[PDB]
Structure formats: C-alpha cells, structure tokens
Symmetry: none
Subunit: 132 residues, 4 copies
C-alpha cells in the first residue's frame, strides 16, 4: 500500500435505512439519521452488535413499535474513496478502521494545507416488521 502519511483519527459516522417487509403509512421514506458514532484510530474496532443496537435505538424514536428483523446490507464509505468496505450482512462481524492517507483541507486565511479528521460512513439497511 503506497501509504505516506497515515491517518491519525477517523470520525465514524452512522446512517441506517429501514425497509419494512409489510408496506405501511407511518413509514415515510427519505429519513436522514446520520450521527457521529465515535472518533477512532486506524485499526480500532466497531462491532456488528453495536451497529444494530444503534440501528435499533434510532428506530425506537423514528418508527416506534417496529423491531429490526434481518440485516440487509452494511457498507463503509472511506473519505470519498471509491472502493468501499462491504461487511457480511448475514453473520456477526467486526469492523476495523481502515488504514488510509491523512485527510486535510485548505486554511481559508492562510492558503496552506491543514490536517483534519478522516471520515468513515457506515451505512446499514435493515428489514423491519410492523410490531404486531
């Protein structure tokens, strides 16, 4: 891996899509629920159990009653990179923060390159059943 400056910290953000296997009304599509999970270092871990708990928590306040049934998909988008990390959506797993080049952005006042936290976006899709 032609890696020069290795990233220092990665902000891990979360987002989940809920699709019911029983069409209803309260299920308004287009929900933006992106939250900052935690800030981690390369190598650090994130479990599939944590992610679900997060997905379940969210659901508790975005679509009361319903309960997450089966995991549809789990993808990790790393700093606008094209290649993404595909997590096994059909068995428990553990995600390790991927190594990468340190991110940075232009300092508006100076015009020089300044370091900033790297980003990871974990997008999950779960199938839910209207709690009956």
């Amino acid at each position: 891996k032609p890696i020069q400056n290795q990233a220092k910290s990665v902000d891990v953000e979360y987002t989940v899509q809920f699709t019911p296997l029983n069409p209803d009304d309260d299920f308004r599509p287009g929900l933006k629920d992106t939250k900052l999970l935690k800030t981690l270092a390369i190598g650090d871990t994130i479990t599939s159990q944590e992610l679900l708990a997060q997905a379940q928590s969210i659901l508790n306040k975005t679509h009361p009653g319903y309960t997450i049934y089966e995991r549809d998909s789990s993808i990790v988008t790393h700093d606008n990179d094209i290649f993404r990390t595909i997590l096994p959506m059909d068995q428990e797993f553990t995600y390790h923060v991927k190594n990468r080049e340190q991110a940075y952005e232009i300092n508006k006042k100076s015009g020089l390159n300044e370091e900033i936290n790297n980003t990871d976006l974990i997008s999950e899709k779960y199938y839910v059943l209207k709690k009956g």
Copy 2:
C-alpha cells in the same frame, strides 16, 4: 418504489481531485475540499463543460501550472443512497438531478418529523499535465 413525496430541493456538492501525469510531491493525498455548486430542483441539468469549468478554476488556485488533461471519473452519490452513478466517460454529457423521496430529519427535542434539503455529491477526478512537459505529444 414510485417516488411518493418528491424532493423539493437538492444541494449539489462538487469535489474534484487532480492526479499529475508524473509523480509530484505537491499533490498531497487526502485533500478534502467540497463546495456547494448550486441548489437545483429535480430534473435540473448540469453539463460536463460546466463541471470542467468548476474543476478548471479550482486547478487555477490549487495547482497553477497544470492543465486538465483527461477526465478519469465522475461519480454521483445521492443522499446516502447506496447506489452511486458514474457519468459518461470519454465525451461531454449532462447530469440530470435524480428523482428521489424528500429528505426528512427528526426532533431530538420533540420527536416529530422535520423536512430538510436533499444532497447530491458530484465527485470528479482528472489527470493534469505540468505546463511545459508532455508524455508523448
């Protein structure tokens, strides 16, 4: 999935990345610089000649001395939609703001629904040439 409630507005974000034909230390990997390009409505278009202008003006301030040489890729990500769309490869094209459901947030105070704008991230990669040099030209 027939768009029930069509999205009202979509803020199109733009980000480019330039790769020199010859390894140049000046090009630091990991630059994050996104900018609102324009808030369009569904069906609204955006030509590649325009995206090029946007990339060109950015090359003028970040990498003076280089010329845009060849477009590598143009990929659009829509509001966390898992499917991204790669635009045409070797010719001019035009992007049509993809139809989608209106984005809605939440209330950490109340717990009710609350509409917010949609996002389209147009990400482009080009190859640049240092003014002067030439691969085989």
Copy 3:
C-alpha cells in the same frame, strides 16, 4: 447520426483483471486474457450477473484461493470508436449491444469488400479477496 447500414452481428469479447485487497506478487501485471463471449445482434442484451460468472470462472482457473469481492469497473469499447461506455457501478445491469454501422473490410487475399462482424470488448476490473481472510469485516 442516423445509421445507413446497421450491423448484423457483433462479436462480444471479454477481458477481466483482478486486484487483491491485500498485496500479492502472484498477480503479475500485464496479463492478457481475451475470450469470445458470444456473437450478438444490435439490441441483444448481456447481463452483469453473466459477466460476473465469466470473471468468477476465470478467477477459479487463474487465481484459485481467491473470491470476487467488489466490481471496480465495466467498460465497453465498440469497434475502434474513441468513446467507451462505462456500465453501472454498484448495481446489477444489463448492457444492450450499441447500435452501429455495419463493419466491413477489404479482404486482402480475395480482393473484394466483405462484411465482417462488428466488435464489442467488455473489460472488467474486480477486487478479489484471498479465500480465507476478512477484508476489514
């Protein structure tokens, strides 16, 4: 750009390249593996699932101990034309043999101008995983 003499048949060539998610020497760069998938008429379809099957079968015979992990790119070059077609990126797709002008030569030996089959070359890049290890997952 109306077509004067539509192409009757087009030979669909297939080529794939594999990139392991983790550094490996066995993956000698410069590999050339072009096979005739099939001969179709304009309008015929070629699905991605069918392309993946070709790629998987070729992986199993050139780099067993690896599985396909993610499709990088699907590009089609049509009869020496400069504009290539990139197929969809993260989703299944169906490519329709692009409509074009009947190909023809000047059959050196015979002396006469004979119609020959047109050509589509579908080149694909896939990221592969050494059967036995988790990428990040």
Copy 4:
C-alpha cells in the same frame, strides 16, 4: 508507475476513422482498417507526419476519391489500460512508445504464463473532402 518487468516489444497498431466534411450519403462508414504499423521498443518514436501518411494511404485504398482535410483527434490506447494518451491535434508532434509492464497470457496447452508483445493502438479521426 513501479515498472518492475518492463515490456520488451510493443506492436504499434493504427486505425483511422474518416468523416466527410460535407454530409455525403455514398461514403460507406463502418470500415475496419486496423493495421500493424510497427513493432517497437519503449522510447521508440512515431511522428504525426508518419501517421498522416498512413491515414492518407488508407484513405486512398478504402475511400479513394477523398482527401484528408483536417485532423480531428489522435488517441493512443495502451494494452487495455483505461488511461489513454491524448495527442495534440492542432500541431505536429511525435509519439514515444510509453513505458509499461510486460504483457503475458496463459498458454492453453501448458497452463503456464508466456510473454507476448505488448500493444499500442493509435486511433485517429480526420475530416475528408470529396475531390472535385
């Protein structure tokens, strides 16, 4: 470009597409004229003057009665790579066979790797004129 095993030889191929200036209906498009121009070593050259000659010449054998008017584009495709060399069309130039990794293919009867010449495809487009 970490060029470990550098290519030994490059079959430089040439193909030219003609579009008549004045929309002509009797001009049969769809002609395939790819011809092996040469076998070269990295660094070897080919000039636009030479490419123009191959073009004019192929034009006289295929669409006799037409003359080259303007050079619209000169592109170079290297062994199936995505990145292509875009030659300057409004000025004379000279092409140098690009450095690259050795091309090989799996020999069907032995199951072993064999070195084969790498390939360059130089594609050109020209506007042609109908004589008289």
